[PDB]
Design a protein around this ligand. Sequence first.
Ligand code: TA0
Ligand code: TA0
Ligand code: TA0
Ligand code: TA0
Length: 124
Amino acid sequence: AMGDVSYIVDSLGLPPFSYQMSLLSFTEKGPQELLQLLSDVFSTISPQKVDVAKEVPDQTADRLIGFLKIIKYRPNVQDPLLFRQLVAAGDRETLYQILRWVVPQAQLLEKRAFVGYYLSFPDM
Ligand SMILES: [Ta]
Ligand SMILES: [Ta]
Ligand SMILES: [Ta]
Ligand SMILES: [Ta]
């Protein structure tokens, strides 16, 4: 829905993205553009650039589902395999749901992933 679009879009305009996406440009994205977007959101967070077109949508799904389980995403759909297949087809509602949950908190998620990564910045 629309509150979700403007939420995702406003959050992409903040760090760690700082990227200006128009409300329309976002809504004009099909399944594959959305999977790519989720893929790029994850790549921005954990310091892994992937072109989803060099994947088949099932392994793209598995790869992004893997990332989401680590960070404890509770899908609306409570059937793991229904989720798998909805992610793989790039279902719009499902993807808006993930993006709405994931994109806000990217700042917090990036910080935690960055932690202990560099020699100069131990976990201490
Ligand atoms: Ta950043
Ligand atoms: Ta980075
Ligand atoms: Ta980064
Ligand atoms: Ta820590």
